[PDB]
């Protein structure tokens, strides 16, 4: 009929927490173009034993 078309707005502001805990298959499968392009200061500084 003519119910309220807006928020409560005193509705639940927290987690469900029974919401979906899995990984959505239809997520973003591409690389984020504006991701971290710098070198990682905390990375492997040693020498790979399996290197050529």
């Amino acid at each position, epitope marked *: 009929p003519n119910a309220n078309p807006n928020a409560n707005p005193n509705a639940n502001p927290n987690a469900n927490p029974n919401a979906n805990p899995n990984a959505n298959p239809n997520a973003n499968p591409n*690389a*984020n*173009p*504006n*991701a*971290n*392009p*710098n*070198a*990682n200061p905390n990375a492997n500084p040693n020498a790979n034993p399996n290197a050529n």
Partner: nanobody
Amino acid sequence: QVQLVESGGGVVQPGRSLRLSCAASGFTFSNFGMHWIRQSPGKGLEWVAIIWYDGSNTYYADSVKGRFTISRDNSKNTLYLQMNSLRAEDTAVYYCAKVWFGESEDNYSVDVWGQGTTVTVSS
């Protein structure tokens, strides 16, 4: 402090090629990704390309994809932009810029811009 010096700009006829270079100093160049950004009076500021610190991933704006090639020489601390098949609308001031340091999951942009070099494409 951080300093970036562009060179290679000038007048070029449409259809020819031109290679811009950007010399970096004051920081470890090989540890940072870089942008090329151009500025023209007609379009304002316009992002052109981005390159990863190791060159593994590069991205280009749609208006330049397939014509421009961004590369780098970490042994020389030099950033390059090879521009082929230039059109009249590519006339602009081109800046190289350094990506800022941030957190691992943040998005990234540039913090230090170069001086800029002028490219005028005209017959």
